[PDB]
């Protein structure tokens, strides 16, 4: 009834459920990783990219 036993049992034990876990995690990882890397890139280049100066020239 412990959490790692049930996490193995209903997610990792079956191979089709393993693949479903991998696919859903891939989609959510794509969204979160794209947001994180885009935010890091726009912070490192604060005021330099076009979207930071796009509002001045409407």
């Amino acid at each position: 009834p412990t959490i790692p036993s049930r996490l193995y049992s209903l997610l990792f034990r079956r191979t089709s459920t393993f693949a479903l876990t991998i696919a859903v995690g891939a989609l959510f990882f794509e969204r979160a990783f794209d947001q994180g890397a885009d935010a890091i890139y726009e912070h490192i280049n604060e005021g330099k990219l076009w979207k930071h100066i796009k509002h001045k020239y409407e």
């Binding site: 990783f33 994180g36 890397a37 885009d38 890091i40 890139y41 280049n45 990219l49």
Partner: protein
């Protein structure tokens, strides 16, 4: 000369973060599937 410069650097940042995630995990898989062999002990039984 390089209109792709900023997009290249963004893709490189994503590459660096993804590789820094992926390398210890793949190394861990190698260490698992090879740690079945690297802890192996051999013995010898000569009959004399």
């Amino acid at each position: 000369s390089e209109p792709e410069h900023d997009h290249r650097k963004r893709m490189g940042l994503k590459m660096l973060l993804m590789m820094g995630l992926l390398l210890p995990l793949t190394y861990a898989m190698k260490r698992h599937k090879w740690s079945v062999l690297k802890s192996r002990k051999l013995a010898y039984r000569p009959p004399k």
